[PDB]
């Protein structure tokens, strides 16, 4: 379970690169292309299938981090249109972060924000390159 593994990360008992940050699998065989942390092959398969899929509202269908989610926050940046589920945000940014972001208006997401690091959520400095290779 992702919850406990992230706990360990915060406790500096485990490196975030050694966990799948999308599902919590320990069978990491590759790097998450957008954020610092590991990724399992299942989630890669999910990512390849779900990434940049869009709903009829003009925003992405699934959480950028986990390619899933039930309630998601949508980026206001029209050049972006990404979304992030409440669970990944509270888990990786930190407890309360989702509620904090929901009250923000306008809200620009973690793939837009210049700071690039939000709690344990760290955007890769080279994610376009990573992405491009992820896809190939």
């Amino acid at each position: 379970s992702r919850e406990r593994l992230v706990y360990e990360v915060r406790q500096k008992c485990r490196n975030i690169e050694d966990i799948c940050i999308s599902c919590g699998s320990l069978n990491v065989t590759l790097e998450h292309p957008l954020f610092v942390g590991g990724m399992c092959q299942n989630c890669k398969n999910c990512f390849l299938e779900c990434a940049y899929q869009y709903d009829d509202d003009g925003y992405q269908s699934y959480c950028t981090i986990c390619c899933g989610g039930r309630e998601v926050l949508m980026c206001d940046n029209n050049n972006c249109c990404r979304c992030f589920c409440v669970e990944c945000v509270d888990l990786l940014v930190g407890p309360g972060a989702a509620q904090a972001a929901i009250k923000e208006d306008p809200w620009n997401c973690y793939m837009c924000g210049h700071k690039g690091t939000y709690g344990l959520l760290r955007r890769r400095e080279d994610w376009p390159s990573r992405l491009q290779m992820f896809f190939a």
């Binding site: 709903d55 509202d57 925003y59 269908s61 699934y62 959480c63 899933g68 989610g69 039930r70 309630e71 998601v72 926050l73 949508m74 980026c75 206001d76 979304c83 589920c85 409440v86 972001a101 929901i102 923000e104 208006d105 809200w107």
Partner: peptide, 7 residues
């Protein structure tokens, strides 16, 4: 932030 429930 706007929110929605995922499909």
């Amino acid at each position: 932030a706007r929110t929605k429930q995922t499909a």
